[model samples]
Target chain A: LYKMSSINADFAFNLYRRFTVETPDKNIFFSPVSISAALVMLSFGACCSTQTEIVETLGFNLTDTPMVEIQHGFQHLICSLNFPKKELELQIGNALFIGKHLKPLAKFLNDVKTLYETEVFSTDFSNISAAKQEINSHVEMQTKGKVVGLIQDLKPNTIMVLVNYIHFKAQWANPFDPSKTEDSSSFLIDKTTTVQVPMMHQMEQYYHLVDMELNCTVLQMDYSKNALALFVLPKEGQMESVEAAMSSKTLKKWNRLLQKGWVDLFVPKFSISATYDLGATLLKMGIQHAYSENADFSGLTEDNGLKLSNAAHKAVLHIGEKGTEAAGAMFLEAIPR
Target chain B: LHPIIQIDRSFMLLILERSTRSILFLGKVVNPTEA
Candidate 1:
């Protein structure tokens, strides 16, 4: 579990917990990896305390893996994804939209390009509407049109905006037959809510695990035998405990303990999208200084006045008989436009 | 005897790359029909 993916997985769980706590009763969805990569890019501009907190909050111990080593790890982590995939369409990208009026450090600019694979775009922040479209239009294409209108409330004085996006599309190894889907008149959302939905059914052998300690059944479905779809079905009224105990270690344990078994399965065909302001979550995660007026990000620019003004995360997921097409985007805003 | 499971209620769905184990989408599906 010491691999980059494990590191990424750990951060994702932490972010998930925050979303669950923020909106206890609502459905939750977002990509934490996108946010992590964006934060890593943000750290280069951060000098000391600001850089330290961003890396620490991202579930990394500086003493164990040092920032420089972690930086190289992500460099390889992002670079290793350049496969010419045919069946599965997976794309990861980053874009830094900087205000034309600002003068960024030459070293910082080259490091972002050489190490992070980020595309730089110079923009006129004076025109809010045009600046908004320019960033959104790039995100729209990077996610294959799955994510749109990702940037909103563009501050006219914002100097730099860093956006990270991950897009994935693929069909299931054993496609769910649309013919078997039925409209369920009674689907329970929670204790007080019941709704109708198109429930897809199938019978197949899959990796299944039952965690009595956590009171949940974990089911794994393959996406053309390349990717995985995991459904953690917590026993009635046990969702809270399951989530509270959910961690990368537990996830690794569940993955290790899965047994291939034959079973009848039913899944709801659904599409969901969520948008969140991550600055609040970051603050709660011990990243308080970055947003303050005294925030130190002098490495990014000549002056030392830049502060984190916003971090917006948006995502959309589609689950159907064919498969899943999903995308999540995270955008970071520097205080100055 | 095989188990008959129905995800008819609240649950968590995680999508990730099998090779890398990097999670792509972590979601809680409550009302599937809702946006």
Candidate 2:
């Protein structure tokens, strides 16, 4: 549990930095209220595990609704973790039997998933305006308007919700032309800094670079907004050295090093999806004490037996010719995306 | 509403963990009509 908690905190912080640096204009927040609300619904056994399991195994054959599909997906993801075999089957049977109680909840869950996926999966800003409207409405309804207020539409697909937002807009102070990009000397592990490489040209403020190890350089990029991105680069063959040097203290040191300067930044335009397990990680991050069948969350369910089932997250990022798009969402009382 | 009947009704609270898919805590409500 302690290990899980530590991992969760690290995941949360790193996720924040990744999004902030990759996409600079988007808005995001972690919806604590919604997370709590979802817990309440789960306590009622909203989607009987039996039905969810069947849906998980057999797949929902009757639904074309993206929202319904996502709801079932999320439910199945959570219940499959620790439910007893017999009890799990019973839960599924219950759902298939008296399933009327789940109609509204399922729809709500579907809507949440739909809105999240629409933005995250979109490639350009063409349908972003409509997406933003739908996302805003859902957040308002989901959070009971406790979050972002309805404002005039700004950017085409300007994201506004409570998870995490990333927006990045930078022009190289000395923009690199393909012609100027060439193999130049780069530092590799073993005190050798003379490898030919293509480094992007940039004269802008970046998180200062620091050497946590003998052959690694770590720099940070403060969004100049509310978040910061910690960028770590390792000398050739020294990736492990940089990874080993990263810790809370190392992160702090990198953050303190950010400054305005002209750096020949050569960050690659690569993106990947990162999936994390938050159960044990979150527990270790000071939230573990709450999982002991005695934790208190009366502020949420009005019922004492309601507790968090699991907290998981997935982050996606892509950089295209148009611009950069990054998104991350944290789910509790639910499953993976 | 009958006051006597209302007095006999019970309310309770329960905390559940979604990650583990288990109930974490449970308690009887102190009052039936209070939020």
Candidate 3:
């Protein structure tokens, strides 16, 4: 989801795709707040305090809020992103999980499209002034009592909100037929053992590769031109031994080794969803110092004195038989009052 | 729908971003299973 403020449109798109492929979900919500956070923290870009102040003044709060049910699910989703380090990965994972689980705040986003009813539903700034009060009240309610008085009192040349939603419901191409789905031979982390895992099998176009150094096999999924999903299923009982062979170089090698060949794919019948706030997490991904107090967000406005206030993103993931469904919403707008 | 009783330029942009873009996109992808 690329907003006009950030000129890194391609990077935004790539990040969005990666977030979805790595972590799919059912519903997702994002706002300029998340975008601001990523720009400031992840990209190590400049930010304007006035802009952040304006965002706060408008009605959105930067404080963290939590929701029940999807708390662990959210964290698990973040963990699936597979960043370099464990600590930083988990930190971003937790932050993003909390930001997305802020359910009430997400509800505030429901009516954003109703403001314009034209056949095309184009987002022109001309018609927004009339809905200011309604928007503010909605935001206040969504954030509950946390964020009050959001959206600044000002005008701008352009405004855009990009929400990318991918919904998928899969029913395994060759469902172990239930009859065949039983406690079968399973190997995990050394030693001979058997664990009951819903083993799914299908003969289809799969990417298979072999690693000489690790002396192991890898399976992967290439979603599109810019992104891919890989599974390093280790030989029976050596899951941990092969797992130690994972790294950027390994990942890259695996990517190069991917070969489309006929094979029987075995997987578990599992469904998952992951959510994150790219703004804060990007910092852990090697994008620090940008969202700091003294960074540059001048491109957002004529003011050379603008610092980023907050940036965040919401991602939803769901995996089933047919394929995967992943959605993401990114919100990044100037903080003006 | 936040009872956004008042509307202005910035407000318009916000609504357009949150409501317009999202809703339209949602409706556009109605037929996900289609080729």
Candidate 4:
């Protein structure tokens, strides 16, 4: 349980740097847990080198962290996340939508069912967009909008779709009063740009720390139970510095240094969403063979030489006078090599 | 005076599970207005 946290945090920062480089001027949001879990599930179908590369990309050293430990770690981490908590709702979904004719190996099929609690669904890939739209609408059934990306271009070889979904809802232990929200507030994008945003103001005691070393102020807000949100505001001209300082050890240090204090908290009301077409990025991260023609997926099935298409993902987050709500899904399309 | 902390500038919002300290969501809010 503890080990996976550090690995996930490291992967979070690593992939974050990738997004920052690609979309420097855009808002970045994602669930590292979703991304990592999806890849780990995908590894079930992979051969030797393919599985090894995926594990390495996820920032786990094979020797120190054995494969069995990694598997049980995810199983328990996900297990603990789903245990019922008052005033908080976390909905998780894991399913495989395989082509009608595709035959997945028995061992791989049963392994995920037992270890990851993944469900299997058989559906025709005659309408890929419709499949994608169904996932989008189901995810957005609560608070909904916007969808994108390359789900088309499915060759005859494409056979399976692996879907992973995460939904979060929590009421702040001390939610900001609506009357205190200031409309038409100013949020400085930079010296040249200041965007109009609604700001929620609250005066209370919160867990906080001002790290002189990182030149950032870290503040924590609690949900009803077993959850918290950390907001870090870096000094002017020090955004890159704060990001550079991100690591599991640093996060632990920040947690150790946190102190509770009465402070004026001003948080902007905003909604941000990002859809990652993860094909290119995963390749850049060194998981190359899975996307190429010479792929090794013998573990999946004997009938077809299945190589994966895009490790695509979409996530949405909303923060407001109420608590925060987020919904995200990672989709993997597999095609024959 | 209570220290005033304004999140008007670019910042990070990391939502985590308390028991494990697992970072459930990692986001950087550069511009809150971006749709």
Candidate 5:
């Protein structure tokens, strides 16, 4: 669990940096766990060089750990996340939609089923539009309608699509009083820009830390159970540098520096949703052959013409006086090379 | 010049100032029900 947490944190931060560099002014939110789980399931169908690249790109090396051990690690992590907690509501699901005509290898299917708990759905790719809708609706249902229209369109030659969905909703242990909420309060976007927004106000003791080097104030808010949210507010005009300096080690350091203190907090009520095409990002991260003509996926089928055609992700997050709700889904399409 | 004015307790008001001890504004709450 510790190893997987560290790996996920590192990968998440790396992905976040890429996202922030692309759109610095936009709000970003996505589940690294969902993306990584989907990729791990895809790696099950990968072979030789493709398998090695997927594993290594995900921050795990086949040379350091046995492939079977890595698979077991993912399985254990998924199961632990699925364990019921009264305070937090979380759901994670993985599925594979294959062209009805193509038969996936028995070993690959069995491994993904037993190890990853992935559901396999066969669809007619000849009518790709309906198949796309089927995949989208399944994701929406699995996430309890938090995610919808995950796939807008499918490639003409798409043979298989993999989906991973995650939903998290939890109530804060110390909720802000609804009666104290102020309407049309000032929220500073920068030094000169101020906007009117509904802000939830509360005075409470929270885990807080101030990073002088980053010029940021960090506060930790606990939810029901072990889940928590870390809020980071950087000094005006310093957001870029503070975000660039973020890392798993920096997170650990902040955790060490955190101390309980009284805070007069005013958080805006906001909701955001974002969609991303991750193929280009993954390619930039050096997973090239998986999406090119030289891609190797013989473990999935004897067909030598399989390559990744599209990789997309959709995420939604809502934060309010009571708590927070977030859902995310990642989709990967494999087509003929 | 100094003068003093007293009113009955039928209305709520506030007299505030420290440095100059001057009345910034004389406000009267006609209705306490409306915030």
Candidate 6:
């Protein structure tokens, strides 16, 4: 569990770096666990060089951990994350929609069902409109309406579509008083610019750290047992360096250094949503042949034309005085060449 | 007696009672350049 957790955290930070470089000023949020889990399902159906690329790109060594152990690790991680908890609602789900014409190998289907708890649904891609609606509705219901219309377009040649969705809603262990929320408080976006935002204020004891080397303050806000949101605030004019230095190792160090202290905390209430075409990003991350015509997925089916064509992800996050609510969905579409 | 005291913009001012040695009020100067 610890090893898998570290791998997931490392992948999350790596993806975050790509996003931050692309859009420095924009707010960004996504579930790396969701994307990685979806890819894991794909990897189960991939063979030869295609499997090698996916596993290595995801930071897993086939030599150290056998393929079956890796699958079980993901199963354990996902189940642990979805464990029941009071005041916290977390759900992770995966599904596959295969073209009615394509017959997936029985072994691949059985492994996905037993290990990932996912079932493959047959859909007629010939009816593009109906296929799109079915997928969107299934995703909507799976995420409890937090995500909708994950796939906007479906090609007639689409052979298979894999999706992973995550929904998280949790209230703070120590709830903030709504009356203390200020509607118009100055937030310094930069050196010369300030914006008025709704800020929540509280005086409480929190796990906090001041890193003089990074010129930043780190605060941990608890949601419940085993869950917390780490807030990082860079000193004025040091945002770039602080952001650039972010990594799983850095986060682990900060976690170790956090100490309990009293603070007069003021946080802004905001909502952010983002969408991305992950195919390009994954290609940039060194997973090359999956999207190319030479892609090999012989494990899934005997069809020679099956190749990943589109990989998209969407996420929404809302932060308020009480706590946070976030949802994300990742989709991988495979089409015939 | 409610006496109003003015101080320099850069310096903070505190009102105290001499008999009890108690702080009556305290305030910080945010902008030193402001009057």
Please tell me how candidate 6 rates in CAPRI terms.
incorrect
Native A-B interface contacts kept, per candidate: 0.83, 0.01, 0.00, 0.89, 0.00, 0.00
Per-residue error for A18 in candidate 4, Å, reads 0.8
TM-scores of chain A, one for each prediction: 0.95, 0.41, 0.41, 0.93, 0.96, 0.95
Clash pairs for candidate 5: none
The DockQ figures for the candidates are: 0.76, 0.01, 0.02, 0.87, 0.01, 0.02
In terms of lDDT, the best-performing candidate is 1
User: How high a TM-score does candidate 3 get?
Assistant: 0.39
TM-score of 1: 0.95
**In model 3, how large is the Cα lDDT of residue A70?**
21
Instruction: Give the lDDT of residue A282 in candidate 6.
Output: 87
Q: Per-residue lDDT of A1-337 in model 2, one digit per residue for the tens?
A: 2222222234433433343344332322321112322332332232334223322222223244233544454445333422443211111100111111112234433443443321222222245565445544543343323223332232432221223221123222233355444344342213432323333333444445446454555444332222233444444455434434434355445446645454545443323334444456544433432344544433222233333445544333432222233333334432011
List the lowest-lDDT window of 10 residues for candidate 5 chain A.
A186-195
lDDT, model 6, position A139: 86
Q: Write the per-residue lDDT of candidate 5 for residues A1-337, one digit (tens) a residue.
A: 5665666667776787788777555556677777888888888778788887887778786766767777888788777676788878876779999888786888888878887778988878888898988999999998889899999878888988999998878888799898988876765544565556677778887877778888777766777764677766665566668667766677669868988877777766666667888988888886778988889888898676588988998887676888878788999998887
Residue A207 lDDT (model 5)? 77
| Model 5 spans with C-alpha error above 4 angstroms | B1-35
lDDT by residue (A46-152, candidate 1, tens digit) is: 87898899988888889888888878877776665545556988878899888887878888889888877789999888887888999999999999998999987
lDDT of 2: 0.33
Per-model TM-score, in order, reads 0.95, 0.38, 0.39, 0.94, 0.87, 0.87
Runs off by more than 4 Å, candidate 4: A138-157
Candidate 2 backbone clash number: 50
Q: State which candidate, 4 or 5, has the greater TM-score.
A: 4
In angstroms, the error of model 3 at A278 is 5.2
Which CAPRI category fits model 2? incorrect
Q: Per-residue lDDT for A137-241 in model 6, tens only?
A: 988888778787888877778878998888877787677788998887766544565556677778788887777789777767777644676666666566667
> Clashing residue pairs, candidate 6?
none
